[PDB]
Design a protein around this nucleic acid. Structure first.
Ligand SMILES: [Ca+2]
Ligand SMILES: [Ca+2]
Ligand SMILES: [Ca+2]
Ligand SMILES: [Ca+2]
Ligand SMILES: [Ca+2]
Ligand SMILES: [Ca+2]
Ligand SMILES: [Ca+2]
Ligand SMILES: [Ca+2]
Ligand SMILES: [Ca+2]
Ligand SMILES: [Ca+2]
Ligand SMILES: [Ca+2]
Ligand SMILES: [Ca+2]
Ligand SMILES: [Ca+2]
Ligand SMILES: [Ca+2]
Ligand SMILES: [Ca+2]
Ligand SMILES: [Ca+2]
Ligand SMILES: [Ca+2]
Ligand SMILES: [Ca+2]
Ligand SMILES: [Ca+2]
Ligand SMILES: [Ca+2]
Length: 92
RNA sequence: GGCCACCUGACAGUCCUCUCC
RNA sequence: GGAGAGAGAAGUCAACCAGAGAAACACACCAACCCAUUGCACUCCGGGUUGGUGGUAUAUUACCUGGUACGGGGGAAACUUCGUGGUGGCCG
């Protein structure tokens, strides 16, 4: 997609509990820039996926490039820019 | 006296309907 | 959301009333597995199995203790005793 503040991550290990997943995700993407929020749900349609909202688009980009395919909980991470702005960025 | 279905009724954390706030 | 009412599923129960009073079932939540899902969201929330926990279910229908209504005993009497849905079919 086109650059976005938020990156969409899928092909994540569905067995990891929400709290732990969000914490590890925060630990791995922290270095690219300030993270405004990380959204994760284990519902039928959202499981295996996560939305990491960066304060700066440039951070979404470096994070996406450097971490594409990163082995996370035994599965290579797939990353794309989110198709639309996350509410906090849009309502901003 | 027992066992199954069924009938009437008592009981009425889900759901539906109605009234009021 | 909340408060009433109707109906009523599941399940338990049976002469009626009252005091005590579980279980069953329904529902919700948690855990572990299994199945399904590769899904672009920002109003939580897939299914199944096993186990567990919970509620003005703080219910009421078993059971328990009192009386009430007919029946069977016994006793001068007083009174004291046991028993109390409809229907068909099948089991000695
Ligand atoms: Ca979780
Ligand atoms: Ca979740
Ligand atoms: Ca890790
Ligand atoms: Ca795996
Ligand atoms: Ca309710
Ligand atoms: Ca008001
Ligand atoms: Ca309210
Ligand atoms: Ca209410
Ligand atoms: Ca009713
Ligand atoms: Ca019934
Ligand atoms: Ca009671
Ligand atoms: Ca009780
Ligand atoms: Ca129970
Ligand atoms: Ca349940
Ligand atoms: Ca699974
Ligand atoms: Ca698909
Ligand atoms: Ca979208
Ligand atoms: Ca939205
Ligand atoms: Ca929600
Ligand atoms: Ca009798």
């Amino acid at each position: 997609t086109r650059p976005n503040h938020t990156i969409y991550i899928n092909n994540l290990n569905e067995k990891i509990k929400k709290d732990e997943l969000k914490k590890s995700l925060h630990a791995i993407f922290s270095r690219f820039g300030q993270i405004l929020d990380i959204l994760v749900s284990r519902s039928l349609k959202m499981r295996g996926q996560a939305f990491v909202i960066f304060k700066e688009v440039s951070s979404a980009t470096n994070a996406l490039r450097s971490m594409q395919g990163f082995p996370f909980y035994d599965k290579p991470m797939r990353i794309q820019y989110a198709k639309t702005d996350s509410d906090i960025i849009a309502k901003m």
